[PDB]
From Swiss-Prot:
Homodimer. Zn(2+) 1 binds at residues 50, 52, 110, 112. This is Protease 2A. Coiled coil: none annotated. The chain holds residues 869 to 1007 of 2193 of the full protein. The lineage of its organism: Viruses, Riboviria, Orthornavirae, Pisuviricota, Pisoniviricetes. It catalyses: Selective cleavage of Tyr-|-Gly bond in the picornavirus polyprotein. The active site is at residues 15, 33, 104. Cysteine protease that cleaves viral polyprotein and specific host proteins. It is responsible for the autocatalytic cleavage between the P1 and P2 regions, which is the first cleavage occurring in the polyprotein. Also cleaves the host translation initiation factor EIF4G1, in order to shut down the capped cellular mRNA translation. Inhibits the host nucleus-cytoplasm protein and RNA trafficking by cleaving host members of the nuclear pores. Counteracts stress granule formation probably by antagonizing its assembly or promoting its dissassembly.
């Protein structure tokens, strides 16, 4: 679990969005596993606007942060799950690191701010949904 709180927006994994997220929907994209909802309180986070390919992410299943080198956002095949059919997930970045079911929502940050959130994993890999291209989050 986990979310990004920026301005009057809450960014979550689309498959973990609550009834309240859907009732306050701003934008969602099944191909990216992202959903953004509106909030009444001002958020605590800031978004990176950069091309960093190194950063640190929070891994809930280890209660620890790990440094990672990750690929640029791209279209990557993801096997079927209870949440989605087998498909290509867009704007996804991969890295070598631990991730298991429950780790989705962990934040990846670089020196500039929040880069994205955990969305995939397994076999010593961790995948992050990028948010750096969503410029409207800043206004
Ligand atoms: C950290 S998630 C994970 C890790 C190891 C093993 C299995 C998982 C679950 C997993 O792949 N999931 C759950 C939900 C998000 C999704 C992938 C996707 N973005 O389409 C569907
Ligand atoms: Zn950066």
């Amino acid at each position: 679990s986990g979310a990004i709180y920026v301005g009057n927006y809450r960014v979550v994994n689309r498959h973990l969005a609550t009834h309240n997220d859907w009732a306050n929907l701003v934008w969602e994209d099944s191909s990216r596993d992202l959903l953004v909802s509106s909030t009444t309180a001002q958020g605590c986070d800031t978004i990176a606007r950069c091309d960093c390919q190194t950063g640190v992410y929070y891994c809930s299943s280890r209660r620890k942060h790990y440094p990672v080198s990750f690929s640029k956002p791209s279209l990557i095949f993801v096997e079927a799950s209870e949440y989605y059919p087998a498909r290509y997930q867009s704007h996804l970045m991969l890295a070598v690191g631990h991730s298991e079911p429950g780790d989705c929502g962990g934040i990846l940050r670089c020196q500039h701010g929040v880069v994205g959130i955990v969305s995939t994993g397994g076999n010593g890999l961790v995948g992050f949904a990028d948010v750096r291209d969503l410029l409207w989050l800043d206004e």
